[PDB]
């Protein structure tokens, strides 16, 4: 059962790291929203 316990803890760590990288990519995309509105590209801003 130790292999499945290791796999469940590894899956929880992978989901936590996925949440961390998605919260980082949210800030990156918001910086890109600001740069696209400063350049005047509204379709790029909506993407």
């Amino acid at each position: 059962m130790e292999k499945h316990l290791f796999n469940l803890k590894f899956a929880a760590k992978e989901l936590s790291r996925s949440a961390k990288k998605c919260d980082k990519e949210e800030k990156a995309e918001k910086a890109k929203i600001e740069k696209a509105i400063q350049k005047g590209n509204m379709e790029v801003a909506r993407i």
Binding site: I33, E34, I37, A45
Partner: peptide, 27 residues
């Protein structure tokens, strides 16, 4: 709302389900 917020921050300047549900309830 996110586009409205981040366009007002740069200074560009660019309910219904209940109403339509009540109107489906009417006819």
């Amino acid at each position: 709302m996110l586009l409205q917020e981040m366009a007002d921050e740069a200074g560009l300047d660019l309910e219904l389900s209940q109403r339509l549900a009540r109107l489906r309830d009417q006819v």
